[PDB]
Amino acid sequence: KGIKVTVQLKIQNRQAAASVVPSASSLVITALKEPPRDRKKDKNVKHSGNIQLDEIIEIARQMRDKSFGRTLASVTKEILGTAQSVGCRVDFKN
Amino acid sequence: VAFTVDQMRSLMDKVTNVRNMSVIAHVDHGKSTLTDSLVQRAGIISAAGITIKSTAISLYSEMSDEDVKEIKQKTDGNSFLINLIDSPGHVDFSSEVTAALRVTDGALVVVDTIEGVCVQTETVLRQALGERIKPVVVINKVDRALLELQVSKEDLYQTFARTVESVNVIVSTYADEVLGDVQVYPARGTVAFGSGLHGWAFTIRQFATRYAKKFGVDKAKMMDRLWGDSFFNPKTKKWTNKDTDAEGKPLERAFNMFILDPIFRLFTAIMNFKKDEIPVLLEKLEIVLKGDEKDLEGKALLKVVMRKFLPAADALLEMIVLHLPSPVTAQAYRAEQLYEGPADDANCIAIKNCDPKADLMLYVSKMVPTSDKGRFYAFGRVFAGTVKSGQKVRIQGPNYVPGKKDDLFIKAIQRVVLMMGRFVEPIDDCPAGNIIGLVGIDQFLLKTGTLTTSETAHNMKVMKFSVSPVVQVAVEVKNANDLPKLVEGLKRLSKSDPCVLTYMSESGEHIVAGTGELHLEICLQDLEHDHAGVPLKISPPVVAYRETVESESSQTALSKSPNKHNRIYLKAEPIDEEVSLAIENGIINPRDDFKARARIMADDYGWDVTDARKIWCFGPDGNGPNLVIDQTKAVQYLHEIKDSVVAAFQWATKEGPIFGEEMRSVRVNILDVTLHADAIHRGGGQIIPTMRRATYAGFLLADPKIQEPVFLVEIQCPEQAVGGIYSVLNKKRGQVVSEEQRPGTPLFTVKAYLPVNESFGFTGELRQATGGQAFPQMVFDHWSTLGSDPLDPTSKAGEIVLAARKRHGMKEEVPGWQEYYDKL
Amino acid sequence: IIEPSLKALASKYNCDKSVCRKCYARLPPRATNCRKRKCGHTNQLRPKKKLK
Amino acid sequence: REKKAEYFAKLREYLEEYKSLFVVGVDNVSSQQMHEVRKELRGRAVVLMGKNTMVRRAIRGFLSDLPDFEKLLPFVKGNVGFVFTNEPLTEIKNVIVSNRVAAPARAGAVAPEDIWVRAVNTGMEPGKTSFFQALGVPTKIARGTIEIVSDVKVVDAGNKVGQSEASLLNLLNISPFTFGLTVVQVYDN
RNA sequence: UUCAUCUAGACAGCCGGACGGUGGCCAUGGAAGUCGGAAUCCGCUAAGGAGUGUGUAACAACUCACCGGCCGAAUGAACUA
Numbered sequence A: 001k002g003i004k005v006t007v008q009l010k011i012q013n014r015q016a017a018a019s020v021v022p023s024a025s026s027l028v029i030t031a032l033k034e035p036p037r038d039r040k041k042d043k044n045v046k047h048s049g050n051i052q053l054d055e056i057i058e059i060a061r062q063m064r065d066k067s068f069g070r071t072l073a074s075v076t077k078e079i080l081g082t083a084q085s086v087g088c089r090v091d092f093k094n
Numbered sequence B: 001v002a003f004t005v006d007q008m009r010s011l012m013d014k015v016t017n018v019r020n021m022s023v024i025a026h027v028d029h030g031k032s033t034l035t036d037s038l039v040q041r042a043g044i045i046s047a048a049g050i051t052i053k054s055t056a057i058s059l060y061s062e063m064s065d066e067d068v069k070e071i072k073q074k075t076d077g078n079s080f081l082i083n084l085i086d087s088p089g090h091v092d093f094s095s096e097v098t099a100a101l102r103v104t105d106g107a108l109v110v111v112d113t114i115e116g117v118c119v120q121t122e123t124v125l126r127q128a129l130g131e132r133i134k135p136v137v138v139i140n141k142v143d144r145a146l147l148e149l150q151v152s153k154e155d156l157y158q159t160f161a162r163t164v165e166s167v168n169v170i171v172s173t174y175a176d177e178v179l180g181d182v183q184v185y186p187a188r189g190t191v192a193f194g195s196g197l198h199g200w201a202f203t204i205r206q207f208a209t210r211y212a213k214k215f216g217v218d219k220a221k222m223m224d225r226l227w228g229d230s231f232f233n234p235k236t237k238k239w240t241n242k243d244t245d246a247e248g249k250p251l252e253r254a255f256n257m258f259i260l261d262p263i264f265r266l267f268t269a270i271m272n273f274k275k276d277e278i279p280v281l282l283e284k285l286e287i288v289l290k291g292d293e294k295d296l297e298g299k300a301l302l303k304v305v306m307r308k309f310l311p312a313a314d315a316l317l318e319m320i321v322l323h324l325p326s327p328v329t330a331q332a333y334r335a336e337q338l339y340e341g342p343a344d345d346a347n348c349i350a351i352k353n354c355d356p357k358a359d360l361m362l363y364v365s366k367m368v369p370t371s372d373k374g375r376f377y378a379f380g381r382v383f384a385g386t387v388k389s390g391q392k393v394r395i396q397g398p399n400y401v402p403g404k405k406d407d408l409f410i411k412a413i414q415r416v417v418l419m420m421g422r423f424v425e426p427i428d429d430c431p432a433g434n435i436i437g438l439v440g441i442d443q444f445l446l447k448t449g450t451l452t453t454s455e456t457a458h459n460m461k462v463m464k465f466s467v468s469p470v471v472q473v474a475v476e477v478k479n480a481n482d483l484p485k486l487v488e489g490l491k492r493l494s495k496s497d498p499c500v501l502t503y504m505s506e507s508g509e510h511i512v513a514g515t516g517e518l519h520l521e522i523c524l525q526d527l528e529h530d531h532a533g534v535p536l537k538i539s540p541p542v543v544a545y546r547e548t549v550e551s552e553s554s555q556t557a558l559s560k561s562p563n564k565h566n567r568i569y570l571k572a573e574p575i576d577e578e579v580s581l582a583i584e585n586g587i588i589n590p591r592d593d594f595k596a597r598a599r600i601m602a603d604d605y606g607w608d609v610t611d612a613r614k615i616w617c618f619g620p621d622g623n624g625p626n627l628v629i630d631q632t633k634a635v636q637y638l639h640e641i642k643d644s645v646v647a648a649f650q651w652a653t654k655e656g657p658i659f660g661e662e663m664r665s666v667r668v669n670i671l672d673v674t675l676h677a678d679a680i681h682r683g684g685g686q687i688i689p690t691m692r693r694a695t696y697a698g699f700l701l702a703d704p705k706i707q708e709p710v711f712l713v714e715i716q717c718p719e720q721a722v723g724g725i726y727s728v729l730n731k732k733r734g735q736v737v738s739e740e741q742r743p744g745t746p747l748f749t750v751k752a753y754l755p756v757n758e759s760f761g762f763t764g765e766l767r768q769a770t771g772g773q774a775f776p777q778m779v780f781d782h783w784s785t786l787g788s789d790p791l792d793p794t795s796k797a798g799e800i801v802l803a804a805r806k807r808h809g810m811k812e813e814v815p816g817w818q819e820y821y822d823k824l
Numbered sequence C: 001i002i003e004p005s006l007k008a009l010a011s012k013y014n015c016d017k018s019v020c021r022k023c024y025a026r027l028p029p030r031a032t033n034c035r036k037r038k039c040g041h042t043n044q045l046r047p048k049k050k051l052k
Numbered sequence D: 001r002e003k004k005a006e007y008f009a010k011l012r013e014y015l016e017e018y019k020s021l022f023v024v025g026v027d028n029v030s031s032q033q034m035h036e037v038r039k040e041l042r043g044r045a046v047v048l049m050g051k052n053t054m055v056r057r058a059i060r061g062f063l064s065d066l067p068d069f070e071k072l073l074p075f076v077k078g079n080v081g082f083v084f085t086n087e088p089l090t091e092i093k094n095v096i097v098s099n100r101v102a103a104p105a106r107a108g109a110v111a112p113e114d115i116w117v118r119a120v121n122t123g124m125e126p127g128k129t130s131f132f133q134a135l136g137v138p139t140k141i142a143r144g145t146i147e148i149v150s151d152v153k154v155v156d157a158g159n160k161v162g163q164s165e166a167s168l169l170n171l172l173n174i175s176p177f178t179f180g181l182t183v184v185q186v187y188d189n
Numbered sequence E: 001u002u003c004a005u006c007u008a009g010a011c012a013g014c015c016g017g018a019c020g021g022u023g024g025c026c027a028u029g030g031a032a033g034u035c036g037g038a039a040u041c042c043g044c045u046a047a048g049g050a051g052u053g054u055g056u057a058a059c060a061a062c063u064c065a066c067c068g069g070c071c072g073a074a075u076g077a078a079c080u081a
């Protein structure tokens, strides 16, 4: 699961525990990037990503705080790629 | 008021008629001179400039029967005993504060009007919160808020509102939930006021009852109609629950009107010399002048005017019996932490019930010394039972556990005495909850100690402080013909201060660890003029460094005899902290069976079982993290060499080649050794200097480095002052391990590894960086390797050994493996 | 004991400026010159050491 | 003037395809609420805030695309822009005259009305009591939670908001230095 | 001596927004725009820099870039002796 940039908002109603998942940019590169870019890189820096990803990242911006206010698929072709050094997909974003 | 020795003993038996407490104070807010006025006012006498030491001062409480008729506690009478200890001030002495809290049930809070509830107030306030002890607010120096400042009535109301509301925070955060309503609000008349340098004090509840007559409204609704949303109406004569009326005009709350307004008219009138209000307002508020009291003017006159209106004992000793808890209902939720042992146990249940004839329990927190040329007394509270002049009391030590001996001295008392601030009296007994002093227990116990009479009864709590003796300084003599006086003076400074700690240094100096510079320096001039009484030479405390290696030797070590015959070929490498730890901690012993000892070091420490069943020794002294692994096979006379090789090795691992000091993590793997044919060229004055010059080359080729000691200091302080502290690590290498806390308390316990070299004044700069708010908890953790070269008189490690070899009078240069190498 | 808003009012004419980096003197935090001759009307300043 | 020239061309293209527009004025907005109101109508009503590009639009109301620019042109005053749509007027009026929502106390902002506050609890832990400390208002410990002892009128009618007082005001959810995004003028066909 | 803003509407002044993904890749004892290096992208309008300083334990928060209000012509950056 999570290690760095994991913001999990806690809304408690007098003991009734329920934690919602804001699934940030690091959360998308783990729920899409299987065991290799998920765990095993604790003592070593994660800087490996280029291969095609597709439509699944458009619904990954849906888990990422949707405060953009216009188009989903459009804003993700920006967030995941230029800020993300692990996952390049289609060589056009940079 | 004088009371004979027996009148005290009769007063002592009545637990419902005896209040035992301390004084929760800041550095200087008015607690010493406030308590000084209660004695020359209503103080019990024997039968007929900073706080260095404290004692339980005694007084007499003679109240009215209808007064004790509103106290929620079991009580029968009005003949009470004031057993109050004058708790020490400022900081660094928070040592005797934890000790005054242990020998009492409540506490006298001494805050200020303008300097409200500062650091030391909430320090001793949060101290009483974790001791289940009850707090009672008393704002002193209210007169300075109307003399040097001259504050208005409604403005001075919100001045005390702030001091009070700031206490409602410290307490409603670190308090016990089984206590409930323990926060002091003048809404019940639990917060006092006054001036200690002028001899007076008052309460809202005093005039609530005093003016309950003049309004017909009882003292409970009179004072609940003074504070809060209660404003009187001098137009219609109605106490309305609002600041205005139908016209929308300004009202002065009942408090500032009927209470304060009267006192201000006294100031400017008396102080400024207006005899057009002196005898006038005298009779308007029911007061009288008499003799040479009429002949005084201004400053000295308004002093006597308060001694004519609200003297000391008035509001002070009044809230002492009315709201303060006596042992009866107090230890009825205190027993838990107060005694470290089974709660449903025999002696534990006796203290919650408080039986002054049953199970005798008496933990002496601090043994109070005297001018009796070195001998002291044992100041301790008698939880349950009665201590007599010559009783067989079980002197249990802080190490003792029910089932062994470990500091168990059950001896009879020489003589029994009473404590009166500075006066001792030859008495006999003292009951459950009351505190007394017993002579002779000292020559058996060590500083703090529990005293029982039952076998199944465990030990009573020995503090927890949460103050720690972080500081450390080297102490010696200025004349060796009186060095014997040096060690004996040091021994009495231990049974002198409860939070003080004396221990010997690894180098050969006498280390003095204190809470701070003030604390340490006081105990140094007291050890200078009293305890010892001889010239001392104090300089910064010298550290011991274990010479460690960081890789394998660049080539194979070579060294033979000066006579020239047999040679040594060893290859010294570094032992990992985990395996070198299993040596000094105890998982693989130097006297362990080589068969199964090697089995554990190969599958759990990752080694070759060959060289493992072949360990020659552990070192230095036979158990340190430096081994002699056997790796050769061409040695026919193996049984004639192992002995004296490890002989110069125990001198080599005990005396280092860099600056005459030991080593750490040095696993010497011997590849080959040229044997002879006879022990005449393989013996005593042969094998000693041979393995000596052999290990010199091995260490100077496997990477020379200096290793120093590391701390684990957890500084407890609120999140608001953390800024300055975090930067003191970014100052003297404070590498954070973790940072944990509770969901409802800001107070943060911060884990950070601290270097011995970067601690020669750590405590001073820490409270300076984030107020006294930073409480350091220093306790040694592990040995971390430096990273610099020791032969570099310019790198971290090299700088150290430069000044270190110049002090011993050794060689100015750092001799390498070239100097101690035997080659063709 | 001075009120946060009344404290900005105290700095408005005691320390909310810049110090000359030659002979030191009080000049606005936006001002970029010196009112002296010991330097010859210089441009050496710094936002007066924000003391904590 | 690269962008000044390309925007002139922009506004004209939308002003021709549609017949209904609104002169939406503001100044009391927020980066957040503004861009998020465009999300509300990402196909029904799109905003286009103009400027001296609208004094050029006086020379564009001079273009003669449909010269009814007379009853529109001079409504260029305050942070005002465009609102393009092709559906009924009262329907889209209800949508945009609901599309305006609150903004917090900017500690030192434009204080307009006198604020009152009931003597009850907020159910928070006593740590913010140090701010109510250097101001002066009694605070009770009910279940421990910070309780207001007075129905206090702290802020007066029209004054300079102090940094300290507007911070504990954000703790009570007080927001009057705002509006939202409304309108200055309307016009169809 | 240049450079390229500018009545189509700038600069000084002052009014109010100063976004989001995002506590961005990591790096993290702790770095959410504001210790560090490397990516310096588009969703969308009038704008919002993976962000200009102050400051936080990190946040928060304010303020600038940028952008709308009104003023309505200069007049500023960069160099010369």
Ligand SMILES: CO[C@H]1[C@@H](O)[C@H](O)[C@H](OC[C@@]23C[C@@H]4[C@H](C)CC[C@H]4[C@@]4(C=O)C[C@@H]2C[C@H](C(C)C)[C@@]34C(=O)O)O[C@@H]1C
Pocket: B469, B470, B472, B501, B503, B504, B505, B506, B507, B511, B513, B541, B542, B543, B544, B545, B709, B756, B778, B779, B780, B781
């Ligand atoms: C609980 O109180 C503790 C803590 O304050 C801490 O553990 C303190 O540490 C003292 C030293 C402990 C080190 C290890 C145990 C190995 C090396 C020892 C030292 C020698 O250089 C380093 C620190 C400072 C002392 C030098 C100056 C001689 C030590 C010593 O007692 O020898 O000891 C007191 C009693």
Ligand SMILES: Nc1nc2c(ncn2[C@@H]2O[C@H](COP(=O)(O)OP(=O)(O)O)[C@@H](O)[C@H]2O)c(=O)[nH]1
Pocket: B025, B026, B027, B028, B029, B030, B031, B032, B033, B034, B089, B110, B140, B141, B142, B143, B144, B194, B195, B196, B197, B198
């Ligand atoms: N302004 C003012 N000064 C006082 C008061 N009480 C004592 N002092 C002064 O404080 C001096 C010593 O105070 P101290 O006993 O050290 O205060 P403490 O450490 O809190 O007990 C006295 O000599 C007085 O002059 C008071 O009520 N008001």
Ligand SMILES: [Mg+2]
Pocket: B031, B032, B050, B051, B089
């Ligand atoms: Mg004192």
